Amino acid sequence: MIDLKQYEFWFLVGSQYLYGLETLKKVEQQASKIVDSLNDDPIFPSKIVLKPVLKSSSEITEIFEKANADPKCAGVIVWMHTFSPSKMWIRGLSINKKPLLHLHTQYNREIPWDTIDMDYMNLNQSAHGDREHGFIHARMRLPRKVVVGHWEEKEVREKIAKWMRVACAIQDGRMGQIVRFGDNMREVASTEGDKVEAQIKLGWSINTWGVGELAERVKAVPEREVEELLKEYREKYIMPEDEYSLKAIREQAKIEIALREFLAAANAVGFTTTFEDLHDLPQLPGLAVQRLMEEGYGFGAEGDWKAAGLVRAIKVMGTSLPGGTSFMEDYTYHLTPGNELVLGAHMLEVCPTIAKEKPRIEVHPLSIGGKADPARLVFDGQEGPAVNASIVDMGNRFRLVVNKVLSVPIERKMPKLPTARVLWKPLPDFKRATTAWILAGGSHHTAFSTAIDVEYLIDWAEALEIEYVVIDENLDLEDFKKELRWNELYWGLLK
Amino acid sequence: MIDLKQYEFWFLVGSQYLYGLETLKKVEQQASKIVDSLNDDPIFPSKIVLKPVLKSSSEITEIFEKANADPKCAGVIVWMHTFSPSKMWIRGLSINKKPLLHLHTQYNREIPWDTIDMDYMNLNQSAHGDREHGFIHARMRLPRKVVVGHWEEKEVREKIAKWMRVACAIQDGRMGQIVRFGDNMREVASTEGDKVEAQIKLGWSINTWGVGELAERVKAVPEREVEELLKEYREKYIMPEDEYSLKAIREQAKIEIALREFLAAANAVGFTTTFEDLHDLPQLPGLAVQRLMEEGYGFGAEGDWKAAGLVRAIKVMGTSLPGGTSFMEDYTYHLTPGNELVLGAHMLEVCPTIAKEKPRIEVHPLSIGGKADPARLVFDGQEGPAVNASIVDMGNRFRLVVNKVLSVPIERKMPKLPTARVLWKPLPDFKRATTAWILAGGSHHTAFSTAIDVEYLIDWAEALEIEYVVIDENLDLEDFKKELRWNELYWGLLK
Amino acid sequence: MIDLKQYEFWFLVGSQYLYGLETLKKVEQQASKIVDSLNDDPIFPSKIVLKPVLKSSSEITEIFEKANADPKCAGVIVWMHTFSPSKMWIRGLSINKKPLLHLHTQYNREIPWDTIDMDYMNLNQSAHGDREHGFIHARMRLPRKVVVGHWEEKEVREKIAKWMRVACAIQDGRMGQIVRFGDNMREVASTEGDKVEAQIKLGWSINTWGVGELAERVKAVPEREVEELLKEYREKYIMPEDEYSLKAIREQAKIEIALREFLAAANAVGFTTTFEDLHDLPQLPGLAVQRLMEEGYGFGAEGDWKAAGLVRAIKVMGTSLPGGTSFMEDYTYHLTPGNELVLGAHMLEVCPTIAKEKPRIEVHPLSIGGKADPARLVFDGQEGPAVNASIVDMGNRFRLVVNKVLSVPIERKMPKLPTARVLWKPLPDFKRATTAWILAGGSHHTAFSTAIDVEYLIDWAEALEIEYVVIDENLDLEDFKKELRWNELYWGLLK
Ligand SMILES: [Mn+2]
Ligand SMILES: [Mn+2]
Ligand SMILES: [Mn+2]
Ligand SMILES: [Mn+2]
């Protein structure tokens, strides 16, 4: 299980040397009083680390040097308790690459109306303290998330925690590696992209291996390791009796063991396969992909590493109780006028986290790629609102298209449909949302997620400086059309 | 053994309907008198086709539509015999994608000083005829090659023939397809690129197949086919006797037959392999690659499809008597002050077209990629001037770096060097040319060619509208730096 | 007396994990053999530090992270001994801000013609090793200096040592701070600039203090410190006898002690004054400024902090045997047709490092700013070639104009001219060079230097990514005109 907990966020308080050493300790004590009570709230998925109050420029750059060196650091929260002049922060901000969150707050809620004096205004320079700081950010063209509100309020705490999840989701991508077993499906364009621009912009390291490398590991698996997987399969899934149905289960278990060993040996965070190139593999890898995705490993099919990396990062985001992130492909539509829906599924690989029922193992005739009927997990989709994202390469840059959707319970049964399925409504209308998905050039391979909001992906794209286009409920098609071309030039030369 | 005499070039003469029908037939007859004598000259590698003199705009667009419809047409040569207004050419030029050559010429060399009358100035309106025509090209931002001179002169004929060779080299790339057996070498950047923008800009269709697909073909080869290859090997090459050296020759022969069968079935023009992904292949492809390159198939190693496609197109260019094009890798330097050279070779694959002596088959221990000692062709390089080109992906666009070099004869013999090799001097100085190659970001995999001049690649880049940077003798390093940065923005927004 | 020696340069050797651990030790030992012999050469003004050969991406980023943290590191020298794939370097190059020098070299000069085998070719993969590396720089648009040649040759060593001096000149500016005593001269434009954009681009921290701050320190100077300065003055300079001339010497001595106390307390590297705002100061700072400039402190007059910072960095460059850097103001011309010259001087402040004769203390009536006759050093200019540079603010960016000049000996003496003076010829012609200086918008305050070449400032501007325009002998006025407009948009949008 790869779940975030080790990542820490560096809370940063600012001051200057042109102050008395007595009032600085009051700021240090108050900052401890804020960050410790912040750690008392269980909403934050990671710890906070208060660092000594900064007064000179050299201290600023010294702390930022340590922020980029420690891999356990995945973000910095900056808050000006008092007036800290910004020209001290220039050299420090010109070196850091960790995401920034600008917390605008004052520790005391109300104003002591009868006791506000000049010795208190000198301490609580909150209003005009970071306004000068935000100028230096807007000036340096630096990407950051701004959040305003009193730290005791819940709304600001939710915003800063969502930013924490995103600020570490990019880190599980700068460190990790994406593995390709076979190249892209031939003549497919949306799955292709510039592998170097991903390392330069997103940080996603990406490499390709021949599938025979996997075929070496799938056969060299011990026999008493697949039975410990079969007892787990029985405790959670499994089809009737010992027939040819269980032969595919043992084959999928042997592939699962090979994949876990391989991805562990090469520090992987996501992987992708191809269905027309898996020789010496006795069967198309199914169920094992769902087993690896159930932990956290992102996956894309047909060579699509775009979707694999997006699914991995967006799975690092949605990691808590309302979890549910899967690799999706919009498969078919339901064109009734009043209740037009869309049924999403794949040929085999759908993550069992968005499942509503008991994940049921099934095997069915599947001639795609020409092997033996592979196993798969079957379940109905989850209810409620969700998001459907897709990153696609635009030649000179990447763009992230995201559609907010409302998933609905399945009304009718499907006896002959072998793969797990979800039904949802694209907001606002199927016609508008789908014609906007087509205008933006969104790929067919998407990242379905019920655990996160559009706020998450918006902070992801803001932190990585890539184009984002959202398809909210207030979607006006013509204004979205203008938005596409106005964005096309901003991200082209500037970034 | 695919050659290029089938391609034809469409000669296009311009006039207008606002003229007498009598002098238009004089223009038609004069154009026939020029084009027939043009076909009589054997310097041109392809035929010319005179099409009826154009007078109206609809005729213009009709001819250009047939130019985009006929696959045998690979270029259009435009010449204004009389004043043809350009606004008729606007709709015709706004639809064609075939390369344009602007022939500026007068059918008669001298001026009839004693017989120049108004019926002759009205006929031979060449001087101010295409001056108006070139304006609509500069205006429409249309790429074309401009050539001025009398068609009887040899210099102009050399220029137009080089343009013909390039204009058919691009067609063997818009139609053909490049095949990849395995992806790129892991973590390598200069060999990687955007496969979609390559189809959009250059037209090179590109796809990837698993190496097991080739391992299927290598084993089902008939037996009486390998000895028919060994007799041809003996007629030209071959190593002593059957011990362990003749086994690898038959292994390479069955690989050659498998590659021929595969590449012919999928309309291929170039192919690329990888040394760390050759599962079920008993031996690294060597001699067979050189055998295919000797005919015309372009090749790149370690997944480099950039070099493979460039080698294929530049082999289509250099196709006649002074032939000599190979896939090269700058392997090692010779740093003596007065006679500093560079030794280029590969691990196995060097085309036997640049060979000077008899290609000698040799087998030597080669542990790269972990297979059985493969066979290879050994020979010394050719003398005289040559060029060394490389196309590389710059994120938003491709750029073509080309170095003019002077090859020198090999002074000493190399008993322990197993691969064929070439020695050359980069113009003007090794320091200047190599530091400019590094500034421009040229790949290590290059396309060495002795059959063509820099004019060829310059018309290639002019016709495809990609950045080209030359390393001529007139190389001033600081101006080259400024050239790189000034070019980065013209090809950035405009194209 | 602040010079350089503490700065260290990190030599960086590249390889990959996909190699045998035995042949990696050969590279480590060979790199030690190169860097130790490099430290044996006294041409290099700073030390070299070999760091373990890098094989994985994480080691790359670890080294670059520590390079930005250690303040003693002022540059990184990169050299690919073997083929190191570039995608490993992406995360490492995307974090460092230290200047890069790309050393292209092979440890052995000639080629072992009779002993070149695959076990030697696998070791010295230098030729095609860093070509792949330079591609990742061209791709990431990262600024760097490329140097090609064998490390035993002296010319390449001269290039790399000049880059070392420049790479540490920028560090004494990212850390240091510039002090202003009074603002700019009123209504003057060329001295003005954006104090924030200087910290963002050049790193120069800049702040202003009232002149009364200096007037407090000038009066509380101990008495037995100024006579201890007068004895040294006698050892080097001094005017006849104790009269009104020595009163100004004691005034300059107390000003010098006050400046020494002030600038050291606030980590200063340059300072600037103004002549129309010196309240409570009994005398305009003269001789004391020359005494501080003789050590290393940069200085600009009339509030010009551009010239002060430029003089400081350009003094850090020219610090060894051929020393000689001063603050200059193009003061008057000599308009004879064949020998048109320009006489450069100021009202008081000319550095005694460019002096040819014995610096003679003199006092003369000077009504500028309304104080008491200040002291000054008088001497004739130096011979040989020199450069005259000037950085100027262009609204959105800075540009660096530099004029190559040839200094000439003074033919006649000037009895009534009170300030030290230099005579030189602007290359190629005074008309061309001065009309190009006016076209480029060069300020009247310049940085005259005899210790450095144009190569130094060209690497300064290349490392800081600012526009540079040179006025060498190869000055073509029309080409310079086009160069200005082509640079304006490249440095306007891109950087
Ligand atoms: Mn699919
Ligand atoms: Mn290679
Ligand atoms: Mn691209
Ligand atoms: Mn002045």
DSSP string, A78-130: EE-SS---GGGTHHHHTT--S-EEEEE--SSSS--TTT--HHHHTT---TTTS
Contact status of C119 with chain B (Cβ, < 8 Å)? no
Cβ atoms of B69 and B99 within 8 Å: the answer is no
Strands (E) located in A235-349? 268-272, 298-300, 325-334, 341-344
Question: Which of C62, C90, C200 is closest, CB to CB, to A200?
Answer: C90
* Chain B residues touching A492 at Cβ < 8 A: 492-493
CA distance B33 to A199: 61
* Chain C residues touching A205 at Cβ < 8 A: 57, 87, 91
Residue ranges of the annotated binding site of B are 302, 329, 346, 445
CA distance A270 to A296: 9
* Chain B residues touching C57 at Cβ < 8 A: 187
CB under 8 Å to B247, separation ≥6 — which residues?
A: none
**CA–CA min distance B396, chain C (Å):** 10
Cβ atoms of B201 and B466 within 8 Å: the answer is yes
CA distance C230 to C237: 9
Q: Given an 8 Å threshold on Cβ–Cβ distance, is B187 in contact with C128?
A: no
Count chain B–chain C contacts defined by CB atoms under 8 A.
136
Cβ atoms of B442 and B308 within 8 Å: the answer is no
Disruptive mutation site among B185, B188, B391 for chain C (greatest number of C CBs within 10 Å):
B188
* Chain B residues touching C142 at Cβ < 8 A: none
Cβ atoms of A157 and A41 within 8 Å: the answer is yes
Give chains near B: 3+ CB pairs under 8 A. Answer: A, C
Cβ atoms of C428 and C473 within 8 Å: the answer is yes
**If we measure between CA atoms, which residue out of A277, A314, A313, A317 comes closest to residue A162?**
A317
Instruction: Kindly state the DSSP code that residue B338 receives in the 8-state scheme.
Output: S
Tokens of A270: 């996501």
Q: Given an 8 Å threshold on Cβ–Cβ distance, is C205 in contact with A94?
A: no
Pairing of strands A100-104, A73-79: parallel
- For the CA atoms of chain A, what is the radius of gyration? 25
Cβ atoms of C374 and C284 within 8 Å: the answer is yes
Residue ranges of the annotated binding site of A for Mn(2+) are 302, 329, 346, 445
Pairing of strands A325-334, A445-449: antiparallel
Question: Which of C134, C156, C458 is closest, CB to CB, to B438?
Answer: C134
Tokens of B393: 């992906």
Residue ranges of the annotated binding site of C for Mn(2+) are 302, 329, 346, 445
Nearest CA in chain B to A279: B212
Tokens of C100: 């890069």
**If we measure between CA atoms, which residue out of C120, C101, C109 comes closest to residue C151?**
C109
Q: What are phi and psi of B198, to 5 degrees?
A: -70, -40
CB-CB neighbours of B97 under 10 Å: 10
Strand partners, C342: C333, C424
This PDB structure is determined at a resolution in Å of 3.6
CA distance A473 to A455: 14
Helix (H) or strand (E) holding A329: strand A325-334
Q: Given an 8 Å threshold on Cβ–Cβ distance, is A186 in contact with B207?
A: yes
**C106: containing domain:** 8-174
Residues 32 to 71 of C: which have CB under 8 A from any B CB?
Answer: 57
Experimental method: X-ray
Tokens of B493: 């927004």
Q: What are phi and psi of A433, to 5 degrees?
A: -65, -35
Cβ atoms of C348 and C255 within 8 Å: the answer is no
CA distance C299 to C310: 9
Sign of dihedral through CA atoms A106, A112, A113, A119? negative
CA distance C284 to C297: 18
State the number of CA atoms in the 13 A half-sphere of B347 facing the CB.
21
Contact status of A203 with chain C (Cβ, < 8 Å)? yes
CA distance A453 to A162: 9
Strands (E) located in A182-236? 205-209
**3-state SS string over C343-390?**
EECCCCCCCCCCCCCCCEEEECCCCCCCCCCCEEEECCCCCEEEEEEE
Tokens of A271: 């992987």
Helix (H/G/I), strand (E/B), else coil: A339: coil
What is the maximal distance between C-alpha atoms in chain C? Answer: 84
CB-CB neighbours of B267 under 10 Å: 11
**CA–CA min distance B478, chain C (Å):** 10
Ligand nearest to the CA of B348: 2
Sheet arrangement for strand A47-50: A47-50, A8-13, A73-79, A100-104, A145-148
Crossing angle for the helix pair C430-439 and C477-493, to the nearest 10 degrees: 20
Q: Given an 8 Å threshold on Cβ–Cβ distance, is C91 in contact with A494?
A: no
Q: Given an 8 Å threshold on Cβ–Cβ distance, is B187 in contact with C139?
A: no
CA distance A152 to A43: 13
CA distance B461 to B441: 17
How far is the CA of A260 from the CAs of A211, A254, A266, A269, A349, in angstroms? 15, 10, 10, 11, 16
The alpha carbon of C449 and the centre of ligand 4 are apart by a number of angstroms equal to 18
State the Cα angle at B192 between B285 and B283, rounded to 5°: 10
Contact status of B217 with chain C (Cβ, < 8 Å)? no
Helix (H/G/I), strand (E/B), else coil: B102: strand
CA distance C149 to C152: 8
Question: Which of B279, B393, B396 is closest, CB to CB, to A210?
Answer: B279
* Chain A residues touching C94 at Cβ < 8 A: 97, 200
Instruction: Kindly state the DSSP code that residue B382 receives in the 8-state scheme.
Output: P
The alpha carbon of A251 and the centre of ligand 1 are apart by a number of angstroms equal to 23
**CA–CA min distance B208, chain A (Å):** 6
How far is the CA of B448 from the CAs of A407, B162, C133, C188, in angstroms? 59, 18, 21, 59
Cβ atoms of A381 and A343 within 8 Å: the answer is no
Residues 376 to 395 of A: which have CB under 8 A from any B CB?
Answer: 393, 395
Residues 395 to 434 of B: which have CB under 8 A from any A CB?
Answer: 395-396
Tokens of B102: 């602007």
Helix (H) or strand (E) holding B240: none
Q: What are phi and psi of C236, to 5 degrees?
A: -120, -35
Contact status of C118 with chain B (Cβ, < 8 Å)? yes
Strand partners, C384: C407
Count chain A–chain B contacts defined by CB atoms under 8 A.
76
The alpha carbon of C345 and the centre of ligand 4 are apart by a number of angstroms equal to 10
Amino acid residing at A78: V
Sheet arrangement for strand C8-13: C47-50, C8-13, C73-79, C100-104, C145-148
Question: Which of C57, C69, C174 is closest, CB to CB, to A205?
Answer: C57
CA distance A100 to A223: 50
Amino acid residing at A200: I
How far is the CA of C393 from the CAs of A53, C198, C237, C270, in angstroms? 35, 10, 39, 19
- B428 prior amide bond cis, ω within 30: yes
State the Cα angle at B256 between B255 and B257, rounded to 5°: 90
Cβ atoms of C166 and C462 within 8 Å: the answer is no
Ligand nearest to the CA of B397: 3
Tokens of B26: 């004089």
**If we measure between CA atoms, which residue out of C36, C115, C49, C128 comes closest to residue C82?**
C128
Contact status of B75 with chain C (Cβ, < 8 Å)? no
The alpha carbon of A445 and the centre of ligand 1 are apart by a number of angstroms equal to 6
CA distance A88 to A80: 13
Instruction: Kindly state the DSSP code that residue C48 receives in the 8-state scheme.
Output: E
Q: Provide the CATH number for the domain around residue C31.
A: 3.40.50.10940
How far is the CA of C161 from the CAs of A379, B251, C47, C103, C165, in angstroms? 68, 55, 11, 12, 6
CB under 8 Å to A170, separation ≥6 — which residues?
A: A74, A99, A202, A203, A313, A460, A463, A464
Crossing angle for the helix pair C454-464 and C154-169, to the nearest 10 degrees: 50
* Chain B residues touching A180 at Cβ < 8 A: 183
Cβ atoms of A312 and A296 within 8 Å: the answer is yes
CB-CB neighbours of A480 under 10 Å: 17
CB-CB neighbours of C94 under 10 Å: 17
State the number of CA atoms in the 13 A half-sphere of C68 facing the CB.
28
